[PDB]
From a paper:
In our current work we have identified the outer membrane receptor responsible for ferredoxin and pectocin import in Pectobacterium spp., which we designate FusA. To understand the mechanism of ferredoxin import we have solved the crystal structure of FusA and two of its plant ferredoxin substrates, and using nuclear magnetic resonance (NMR)-driven molecular docking we have modelled the FusA–ferredoxin complex. The discovery of FusA demonstrates that, like their mammalian pathogenic counterparts, phytopathogenic bacteria can use a TBDR to specifically target iron-containing host proteins. In summary this study reports and the structural characterization of a TBDR receptor that binds to iron–sulphur cluster containing ferredoxin domains.
We solved the crystal structures of Arabidopsis ferredoxin isoform 2 and potato (Solanum tuberosum) ferredoxin isoform 1 (CAC38395) (Ferpot) and performed docking with extracellular portion of the FusA structure using the programme HADDOCK22. Docking solutions formed two major clusters in which the ferredoxins docked with the extracellular pocket of FusA, with the C terminus either pointing up and away from the FusA barrel or at right angles to it. The C-terminal up solution was favoured for both ferredoxins. In this solution, the ferredoxin molecule is positioned directly over the pore of the FusA barrel and forms extensive interactions with the β-wall formed by loops 4, 5 and 7, and the plug domain loop of FusA. To investigate this we tested purified leaf ferredoxins from potato isoform 1, maize (Zea mays) isoform 1 (ACG46956) and Arabidopsis isoform 2, which share 70–75% sequence identity, for their ability to enhance the growth of a panel of Pectobacterium isolates. Arabidopsis ferredoxin enhanced the growth of 14/17 strains, while potato ferredoxin enhanced 9/17 strains, with a noticeably weaker overall effect. Maize ferredoxin only enhanced one strain weakly, demonstrating that the discrete amino-acid sequence differences between the ferredoxins have a large effect on the ability of FusA to utilize the protein as a substrate. On the basis of our docking experiments, a number of the amino-acid differences between the three ferredoxins occur at the FusA–ferredoxin interface.
Numbering used by the authors: 2 to 99
The structure:
Amino acid sequence: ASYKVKLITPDGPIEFECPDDVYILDQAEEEGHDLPYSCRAGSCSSCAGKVTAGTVDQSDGKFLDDDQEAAGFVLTCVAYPKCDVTIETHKEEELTAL
Ligand code: FES
């Protein structure tokens, strides 16, 4: 019901606990962290990250195709944690370089 989220940013790790019914980006902001975003609606690539451990539910978002979702990309503005999760943030360049 609350999961440990570790975010691997360009200048290192940050973790917090995040309820299973709160989006990861929302919770990160309640915790004082500043992450990239634009639409907050699952329809651009601005908030993109990559899951390196655990799983998320991001079915509220529509931007990613199945090859991107398969490579672990995630839209942090519309993603709920489903277990303890590790997510490397600021992945817009890499996603949009696929
Ligand atoms: S800010 Fe656009 S998909 Fe997250």
